[PDB]
Write the structure tokens for this entry.
Amino acid sequence: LTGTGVLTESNKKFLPFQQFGRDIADTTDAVRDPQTLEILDITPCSFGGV
Amino acid sequence: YTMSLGVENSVAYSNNSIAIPTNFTISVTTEILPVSMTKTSVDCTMYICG
Ligand SMILES: *[C@@H]1O[C@H](CO)[C@@H](O)[C@H](O)[C@H]1NC(C)=O
Ligand SMILES: *[C@@H]1O[C@H](CO)[C@@H](O)[C@H](O)[C@H]1NC(C)=O
């Protein structure tokens, strides 16, 4: 699961087998770290029209 | 069922009969109109190429 974003700890409680989390419109918004099983939120790196 | 357009009313017309209202009701009627969309803008490079 390659991507670019800001990673933080999160209040999400994945079931033991679940590895990734998705928003309403398929976009990935969380992941489980594979070496210590914390659930990380993903949000896009900040952007906007100049 | 075949739908009904409204109740029938044979108006009491004759060449020398008039109906005049003896009282009134002030009616307050709500009318609702759209005026503006949500203002979208899209970075078409970030949408297409990620
Ligand atoms: C991964 O290895 C480290 C060092 O041995 C250990 O602290 C950690 O608990 C291990 N995690 C898993 C999910 O096995
Ligand atoms: C007119 O209508 C009101 C209620 O809307 C009623 O109280 C009043 O007595 C009526 N007046 C007449 C002259 O019928």
About this structure: Strands of chain A lie at 6-9, 20-22, 28-32, 39-43. Residues A 35-36 surround 2-acetamido-2-deoxy-beta-D-glucopyranose (ligand 1) (CB under 6 Å). The first strand of chain A starts at residue 6 and ends at 9.
